[PDB]
Design a protein around this ligand. Sequence first.
Ligand SMILES: [Zn+2]
Ligand SMILES: [Zn+2]
Length: 354
Amino acid sequence: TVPDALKDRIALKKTARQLNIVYFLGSDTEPVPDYERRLSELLLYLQQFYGKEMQRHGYGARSFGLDIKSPGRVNIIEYKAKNPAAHYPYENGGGWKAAQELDEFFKAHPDRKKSQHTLIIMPTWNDEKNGPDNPGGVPFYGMGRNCFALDYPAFDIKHLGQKTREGRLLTKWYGGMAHELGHGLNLPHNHQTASDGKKYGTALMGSGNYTFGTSPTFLTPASCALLDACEVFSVTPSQQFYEGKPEVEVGDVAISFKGDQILVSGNYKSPQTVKALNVYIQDPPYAVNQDYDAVSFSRRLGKKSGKFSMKIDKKELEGLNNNEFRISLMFILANGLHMQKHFTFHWDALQDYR
Ligand SMILES: [Zn+2]
Ligand SMILES: [Zn+2]
């Protein structure tokens, strides 16, 4: 009743909002057997991973909230869809179609919606391409505050880390869920620093979807700074999330290069508290799926206005190898919105900025 992988687990702080879990069934789709237990175990272990990382970074035992209906059992919404499975495929807006239908379901049942974040899980298609040994066919990506992942018969934590086809399949699809959930929880891609890579392994939002459960995987300071400002990690019920627009004035920005060091400083002013500054340094190209390489840093601010100061060591920029690089400054607000400013440089023609 308790898998071995959950025997080591921490008590977590109650949160003001919880991640919704929807098991999304096409009108012609049968659940994968034993999904309530299998997915509860996997989700509770995922919750442990995120909560232990938040604690290790100084935020206390805070994870994404889950609605628990009995010991070891998540309150999963089993949703029977209006249309057959073929109507909500990975491609061509299948995920948006599912999400719109769930918007209708939550409008008609607002008691069952516990936050603005939802993880939708669909069973694998079973055809000539996909099946229990090669899951796929369904949405599998982040979509705003929503994210999509899948289920299949061996999607069971008992295989975690095992040197078997089931174990390798699990790290692929469980690591995948962990990473897509990160996107759903407002996380962009980022890469571990050189020092963190040596101590803690592979960043989950970098290539950690390939390592989760098999080799050491972790969450960066910058990811934890965003989770600190994510609705389902809130221990402050007075705080409302994601309303309005990010309003930050950023002035007197200086970026200077002195030996091996990158100096970043400036001032900020917001009507909201500014929780933190994340700094991302990456090689081109810069699209939202060409940024697995962005090495990230974070600094706590915690005021509505003030100055920021940061020295970044170039030797921590593990993996970067382009003459051209971009520094992004991301200001994270208390309501979970953020704004960014970008600056591009060239190592062979380094120009201090303002
Ligand atoms: Zn991703
Ligand atoms: Zn890049």
